[PDB]
Amino acid sequence: AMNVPFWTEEHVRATLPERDAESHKGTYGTALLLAGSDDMPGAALLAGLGAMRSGLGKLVIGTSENVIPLIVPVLPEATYWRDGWKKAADAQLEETYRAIAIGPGLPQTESVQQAVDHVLTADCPVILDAGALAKRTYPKREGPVILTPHPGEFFRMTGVPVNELQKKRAEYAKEWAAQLQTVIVLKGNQTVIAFPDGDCWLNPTGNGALAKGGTGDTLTGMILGMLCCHEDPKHAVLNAVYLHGACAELWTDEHSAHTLLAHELSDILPRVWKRFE
Amino acid sequence: AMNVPFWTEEHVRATLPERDAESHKGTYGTALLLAGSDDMPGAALLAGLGAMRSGLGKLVIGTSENVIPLIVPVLPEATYWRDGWKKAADAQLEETYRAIAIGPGLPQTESVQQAVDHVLTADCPVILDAGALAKRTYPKREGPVILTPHPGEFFRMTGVPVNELQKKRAEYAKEWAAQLQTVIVLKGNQTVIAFPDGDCWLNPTGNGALAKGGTGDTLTGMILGMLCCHEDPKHAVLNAVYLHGACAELWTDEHSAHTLLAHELSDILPRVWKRFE
Amino acid sequence: AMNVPFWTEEHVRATLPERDAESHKGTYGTALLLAGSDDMPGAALLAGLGAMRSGLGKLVIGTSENVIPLIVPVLPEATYWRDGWKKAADAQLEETYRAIAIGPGLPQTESVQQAVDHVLTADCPVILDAGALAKRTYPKREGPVILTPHPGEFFRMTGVPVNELQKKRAEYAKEWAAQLQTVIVLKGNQTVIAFPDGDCWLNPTGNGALAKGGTGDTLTGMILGMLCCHEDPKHAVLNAVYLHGACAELWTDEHSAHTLLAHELSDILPRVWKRFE
Amino acid sequence: AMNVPFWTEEHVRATLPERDAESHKGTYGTALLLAGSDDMPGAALLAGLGAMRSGLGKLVIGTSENVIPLIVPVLPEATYWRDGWKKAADAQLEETYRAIAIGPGLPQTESVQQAVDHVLTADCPVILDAGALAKRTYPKREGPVILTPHPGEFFRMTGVPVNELQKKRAEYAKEWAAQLQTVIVLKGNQTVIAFPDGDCWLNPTGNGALAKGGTGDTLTGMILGMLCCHEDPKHAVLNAVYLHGACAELWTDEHSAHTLLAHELSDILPRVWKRFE
Ligand SMILES: Nc1ncnc2c1ncn2[C@@H]1O[C@H](COP(=O)(O)OP(=O)(O)OP(=O)(O)OP(=O)(O)OC[C@H]2O[C@@H](n3cnc4c(N)ncnc43)[C@H](O)[C@@H]2O)[C@@H](O)[C@H]1O
Ligand SMILES: Nc1ncnc2c1ncn2[C@@H]1O[C@H](COP(=O)(O)OP(=O)(O)OP(=O)(O)OP(=O)(O)OC[C@H]2O[C@@H](n3cnc4c(N)ncnc43)[C@H](O)[C@@H]2O)[C@@H](O)[C@H]1O
Ligand SMILES: Nc1ncnc2c1ncn2[C@@H]1O[C@H](COP(=O)(O)OP(=O)(O)OP(=O)(O)OP(=O)(O)OC[C@H]2O[C@@H](n3cnc4c(N)ncnc43)[C@H](O)[C@@H]2O)[C@@H](O)[C@H]1O
Ligand SMILES: Nc1ncnc2c1ncn2[C@@H]1O[C@H](COP(=O)(O)OP(=O)(O)OP(=O)(O)OP(=O)(O)OC[C@H]2O[C@@H](n3cnc4c(N)ncnc43)[C@H](O)[C@@H]2O)[C@@H](O)[C@H]1O
Ligand SMILES: [Cl-]
Ligand SMILES: [Cl-]
Ligand SMILES: [Cl-]
Ligand SMILES: [Cl-]
Ligand SMILES: [Mg+2]
Ligand SMILES: [Mg+2]
Ligand SMILES: [Mg+2]
Ligand SMILES: [Mg+2]
């Protein structure tokens, strides 16, 4: 390795925020989630649940109109911007959000990139995932840009083939976080969290129960919510990745690692988070 | 303070109603919930669940047609008045209800105010929340009118800015309950329950887990149901606010306060209510 | 009273059927449930769940087309006869069913009565509930006809006002079961189960948690399923009514009687039924 | 008998795969499920849940367009091929899958057979169930073909009447697995798993709780998922059938065998599978 340190339980315990008696939901902010399309609807539910579970005050889901009815019965606490991810291709966000995520369940299209460009003119942290991940550069702005690639997405972004990436994961994550001036959460066993200021950590939690469709959609939502309740966005990303993996570890105490469904990570998070308080 | 007393556990225990062996659902009344729009559907599910959980006999949900399918799989016990909140703008209620709530998930429009005006000609308690909260006066009628503003809604109603309101919450709640001749449930930590006869209490339960979208929608439903099973509507409002907060406190025994979803308050209420019996 | 005996735990234990190792789902029959309309959809979900929980082999739900999508995510084990309750107004059932129920969530219309007339030409037990309950007579047929009126429905059927009915419930139930030559399950505390052969029992289970919308829809489904797995339809009706009430009693051990939702009765039935085996 | 051996717990324990720390979801493959039609939608949800529960990496559900919204809220981890089972009638699969299942909730039509013919040109294991089961032969190909008939389906396939089949189940299953050169999972108590190479086993698990609509749909999904995580497809089929039955046995420890709903088998599988690890 390059001796990248693990973000450990001690670090998590020291950095997780309080929800004090005097707070109101405004204290914890409104998040925007731009996710889910008619063709890939479930991602929006997975990210929505992860976000509302993770300490935000309010969530607006800008999903395709036909996806909205699929979310409501499961997550009636979310509100909507009808066809929001499409509308965001055409104009600047008018509303102020605490944090924004774009990409889960979105196609890898130019229109999604147009939406990204408009999202990036906001002054808040922004997460790009999935369909929003492309080979491109980023404008100087206020607020971190957080990319959350699977190794195959990292290849799409950089041209580094997966078989080579996997030999030197932190080295590549660090190099590209620096070059792009973005946070890179390079997924996998020992997920790398590389920051554009050159800080970098490894995540010590998780297991093979996570190697199934949807678990990254859940993670994007987790990061989104934690960006709303942490003052330091670096700590939000680190804690989200950590607690996401910790949920999978709790699952495998009494359940087979073959059998986890992503949404259950959100259902487990309430008890797992308590343990670190 | 003004030494406003807390509505304590002792008061709750002394005032919660029995559901005796000889009762039928008619004993507990039919409630009407005018809530949920295509743009804000989840509020109707949240309030519906809170209402059916809270001791009513039957619930009619007057929600937008497209919202009905989103409620049914979760709350198949509810019945419907298709587009009821819209229809209520145009004519008097023909049916007799035990209690009525209007506003969760409704827009802040003149048409919603027209619906309010028609709701107020019924002889039963009425709850106004959310979109139904405006700067206006109320007609002399039979049955209490119960307003449930968040501080921002209170500002909309009165012109008292939130930063000033928060310095003297009970004083302002009492003054405006008197002026409007309505019950005011002024939300927040230490929620104020101010009555138009000058009685006023503070609620001692709850915590920051409640500072998230949807929890007030759940509360409106709780108050609606409790108005159906309490003979004294004052006690219904007080017990609803109390038990709502108590559910959040049970949650935080083994779950992080960051992670509560409003609908879970309704799922917790069955066991919490038992404890006070 | 008239000293009508209670159908006791001892009777239930002696009459509940086995599900032996050598059985196949055909042994337990296909039930037809004609229930749910666009205006009252939830009844079909409630009765569907109660029926599939109660020992049948297969369930066909003949509900309105727009109701089908509301059932599937909750009860994916059911199959459908699209617009079946409407189609049944126009022709004889072609398929053979083990048992049929009609009425939950159906309007009190002539077309529903036409459907009833066609249902009654089948040779199997038939349950009429809700919208299918009217002032009418019944044709001599093979298989019992089981009416499940609430006292208000009994008034509609017979002209006996509810305040008079309630003074002499068994006497009236027996008289009308005899006159109509139908089973009458006259609902309420101490539900009466009156048979056209003059046998009559009282149900000893249940409590005020049941005095809420939907619980009778659940019961109709329970009776439907139990008619499929009991050889003796009398025992099916008696056991269904008993175990339905027993579920409410289990609920109130740790939950307030004000807070039960009907569908939960079906969720409780698996464990309650085990106790009587 | 013919002394066909039971696939025992010892065999299951020796053959169930690990999900190691270094794995990614690609290791576990993408499955295709061609299931569910407007008329029989629930089968697709049941098989989808069983498949995602059973160790695959990703699931694509090729179901009718109107069925997709019914799956998403329950199984947001699945992705879709809109009208896939219909489209498969018209062209070869372009995408590579680890395993494919076709038939649950599909009609017994020529178009479904056309889809089968195209599925069979893939090089992967394929499961045919329900509507995909017909009297026909199979082309020489790479990858096993796995037929999962109920006795009535076996009759449809072979002309052997059910009353005769049931007297000599293994003998008939073996003879027809050989003749067709397919795996035959002949369902029932003591389900027969007959292989075209002449190997044959009996399944020792399960009980009458399984004799209800939907449980076979769940099984098809289980086999589909296990084909993705086992290197040996024979062991996948055997373990799926075994663990499916084991879930029903866990259910009946504290719940009546009359009351199981198929989807619950998938909910039980996580804990049951752990026990065999
Ligand atoms: N060579 C290639 N191989 C594969 N894909 C390629 C590719 N080349 C291009 N691609 C592609 O890149 C994309 C891969 O995404 P997909 O693999 O298609 O992702 P998905 O099913 O949509 O799931 P999701 O997005 O929820 O999970 P994620 O991986 O984010 O999140 C997974 C989560 O689980 C965690 N996780 C997984 N395995 C783990 C383990 N063993 N230990 C600990 N954590 C683990 C991860 O760290 C993370 O948090 C596709 O567009 C695609 O076609
Ligand atoms: N300056 C301003 N700030 C904010 N909004 C402004 C504003 N000016 C105008 N507004 C506005 O006023 C409205 C505020 O509503 P929103 O804040 O938009 O409400 P919501 O997300 O729709 O949630 P809900 O209605 O379910 O929760 P509620 O607060 O009723 O219910 C919350 C429940 O949780 C309880 N709760 C919250 N925090 C608690 C705590 N710390 N302790 C105990 N209980 C707590 C409350 O008492 C209550 O029961 C908006 O229309 C709006 O734009
Ligand atoms: N004077 C009048 N009063 C009322 N309605 C009148 C009326 N005159 C005419 N009507 C009418 O008659 C109908 C009454 O039905 P509704 O009262 O409208 O029934 P629902 O909300 O649709 O619920 P459901 O059908 O699921 O419950 P049910 O009562 O079957 O099932 C309830 C279940 O709970 C049980 N239950 C209820 N209370 C119980 C208790 N205290 N103890 C034990 N069990 C109890 C019952 O035995 C039964 O199993 C309406 O059409 C109507 O307008
Ligand atoms: N004479 C005839 N009798 C019946 N049908 C006939 C027939 N002639 C033709 N048919 C027909 O054949 C088909 C029978 O299917 P259906 O019986 O209509 O099946 P389904 O309701 O759609 O349920 P599913 O498909 O989920 O359950 P399956 O049986 O696969 O899966 C059931 C699962 O439960 C297990 N199981 C059942 N009973 C068990 C027991 N007692 N012990 C252990 N396991 C048991 C099975 O092994 C299996 O895993 C129909 O098309 C049909 O019309
Ligand atoms: Cl708040
Ligand atoms: Cl009642
Ligand atoms: Cl069967
Ligand atoms: Cl992965
Ligand atoms: Mg991803
Ligand atoms: Mg509110
Ligand atoms: Mg009824
Ligand atoms: Mg089948």
Q: Where are the domains of chain C?
A: 1-277
End-to-end CA distance of chain B: 32
Q: Could you give the count of Cα atoms lying within 13 Å of B139 in the half-sphere of its Cβ?
A: 10
Cα(A209) to ligand 8 centroid in Å equals: 10
Q: Hey, is the C-beta of C250 within 8 angstroms of any chain B C-beta?
A: no
Nearest CA, atom 5, ligand 3: C152
Nearest CA among A43, A11, A58 for reference residue A236: A11
Q: How many CB pairs under 8 A join C and D?
A: 105
Of ligand 2's listed atoms, the one at least distance from the Cα of B40 is: 22
- Which residue in chain A has the smallest CA separation from D272? A255
- D102 φψ region: left (φ > 0), alpha (ψ -120 to 50), beta (else): beta
Strands A58-62 and A30-34, sheet pairing: parallel
Q: Which residues share a beta bridge with D31?
A: D59, D99
Please name the helix (run of DSSP H) or strand (run of DSSP E) that holds residue D217, with its range, or none.
helix D215-229
CA separation, residue D261 to residues D171, D210, D269 (Å):
31, 8, 13
- CATH 3.40.1190.20 for the C1-277 domain, yes or no: yes
> What is the spatial distance between Cα D211 and Cα C22, in angstroms, rounded to a whole number?
10
Contact C187, C224 (CB under 8 A): no
3-class SS at C81? coil
Cα(D116) to ligand 3 centroid in Å equals: 51
Largest CA distance in chain A: 51
Residue A103 CB–ligand 1 contact under 6 Å: no
3-class SS at D146? strand
CA separation, residue C241 to residues C32, C131, C155, D42, D213 (Å):
19, 20, 21, 29, 24
Sequence-ordered strand ranges (E) for A98-175: 99-102, 126-128, 145-147
Nearest CA, atom 18, ligand 3: C213
Nearest CA among A115, A124, A46, A109 for reference residue A78: A46
> What is the spatial distance between Cα B77 and Cα B97, in angstroms, rounded to a whole number?
17
CA separation, residue B208 to residues A232, B248, D23, D72, D73 (Å):
20, 8, 39, 31, 28
> What is the spatial distance between Cα D154 and Cα C248, in angstroms, rounded to a whole number?
44
> What is the spatial distance between Cα A21 and Cα C86, in angstroms, rounded to a whole number?
56
Q: Which ligand is nearest to the CA of A166?
A: 1
Shortest distance between the Cα of B183 and any Cα of chain A, in A, equals: 22
Shortest distance between the Cα of B22 and any Cα of chain A, in A, equals: 35
Q: Could you give the count of Cα atoms lying within 13 Å of C87 in the half-sphere of its Cβ?
A: 13
Resolution in Å, one decimal, please. 1.6
> What is the spatial distance between Cα B174 and Cα D256, in angstroms, rounded to a whole number?
57
> What is the spatial distance between Cα A168 and Cα A181, in angstroms, rounded to a whole number?
20
Q: Hey, is the C-beta of B10 within 8 angstroms of any chain A C-beta?
A: no
> What is the spatial distance between Cα B30 and Cα C105, in angstroms, rounded to a whole number?
17
Shortest distance between the Cα of B140 and any Cα of chain A, in A, equals: 34
CB-CB neighbors (< 8 A) of B46 in chain A: 76-77
The answer to the question of whether B143 is labelled as a binding residue is no
Nearest CA, atom 1, ligand 3: C152
| CB proximity list for A9: less than 8 A, separation 6 or greater | A276
Please judge whether D68 and A41 are an interchain contact, meaning their C-beta atoms are less than 8 angstroms apart: yes
CB-CB neighbors (< 8 A) of D25 in chain A: 211-213
Subunits with 3+ Cβ pairs within 8 Å of A are: B, D
Q: Hey, is the C-beta of D35 within 8 angstroms of any chain C C-beta?
A: no
Method: X-ray
Q: Hey, is the C-beta of A274 within 8 angstroms of any chain B C-beta?
A: yes
Contact A218, A46 (CB under 8 A): yes
Structure tokens at B246: 């108590």
Residue D87 CB–ligand 4 contact under 6 Å: no
Nearest CA among B265, B247, B256, B258 for reference residue A272: B256
Task: Determine which of D77, D247, D263 to mutate to test the interface with A (most A C-beta atoms within 10 Å).
Answer: D77
| Residues whose Cβ atom is located within 5 A of ion ligand 5 | A 24-25; B 211
Q: Could you give the count of Cα atoms lying within 13 Å of B219 in the half-sphere of its Cβ?
A: 32
Structure tokens at C57: 């082999």
Alpha helices in A29-168 (DSSP H): 42-52, 68-71, 84-87, 110-119, 151-158, 162-165
> What is the spatial distance between Cα A112 and Cα A117, in angstroms, rounded to a whole number?
9
